Amino acid sequence: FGVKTEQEDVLAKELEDVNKWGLHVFRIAELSGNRPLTVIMHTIFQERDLLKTFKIPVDTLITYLMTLEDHYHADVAYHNNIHAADVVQSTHVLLSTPALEAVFTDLEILAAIFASAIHDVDHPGVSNQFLINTNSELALMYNDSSVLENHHLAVGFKLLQEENCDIFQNLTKKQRQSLRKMVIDIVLATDMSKHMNLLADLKTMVETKKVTSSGVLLLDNYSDRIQVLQNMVHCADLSNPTKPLQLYRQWTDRIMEEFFRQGDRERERGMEISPMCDKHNASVEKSQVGFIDYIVHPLWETWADLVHPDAQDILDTLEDNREWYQSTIPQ
Ligand SMILES: CC(=O)Nc1cccc(-c2ccn([C@@H](Cc3cc[n+]([O-])cc3)c3ccc(OC(F)F)c(OCC4CC4)c3)n2)c1
């Protein structure tokens, strides 16, 4: 009575690393009875005093979080609640980077974290292209346009209507409309088809980079604010390779399982399969190296530049991991 159970205490101790890059999220997933998203989100909300700032009733926050977590598929290897929790915690750490100290408002912080929590809800385990090519209801509903991302948003928002789930019930119409717009802009930016444009804009920003007195990033207009937030959650979404190898490897195993599974369906449907999704002709090591060289490193290198030198350690880990997988390539 009043005191945590032994498993709850062990979980609480793991959660003490919530502000660190490399949180044992899989461990937390096990300790919380597969409730990584709910506990990590609750920990972050209270850490950031978001409940008080936005007058979010605690029972309501917990109810919505568990409901949201329940709408992630536990039978999906990668795009599940653990990934959601990871992206959330990673965005949380990124928001704390010294270069962005005092830059964003509480509402923007709330938008970035909420966006992260719902960015992949109800993911079926197959890609937009697969959905489009199989004439799936989802693809027809959203006209082949950022199919999954539009769906994650619609679900994320619709769940607020369930019993005692409206965590934004006390925000004014102004706060809600602004919050909603920012969340929509952020989740839509997670669609990989927008990667090049986002990176281009981020690079341009690093080019025109301008700080303040204390050397903190200066962002005037909404376009700049939202771009940085969009790239932030995007970085968090593509952060697996920048985490300690032990974590990175579990992510790779999961994504490969999900991809090979899709490949198996395409093979049966008689569709063409990418080496990436072909369990028969697949080079996991090469795929990760390509992934890092063409996508992850160019992204994180530009982000490192924007907040230089705050992300120096993350970049070093990415490069060490890249070399690890490279040397793993058989011959
Ligand atoms: C079947 C399928 O989706 N194929 C496909 C085709 C082209 C690019 C990508 C793609 C680009 C970024 N990712 C994300 C996961 C991700 C997927 C989609 N969006 O909207 C955002 C992120 C992604 C995250 C982690 C990965 O590996 C490891 F870190 F766990 C990964 O591995 C890529 C290598 C297998 C070769 C890809 N996925 C995926």
Ligand SMILES: [Zn+2]
């Ligand atoms: Zn996604």
Ligand SMILES: [Zn+2]
């Ligand atoms: Zn994702």
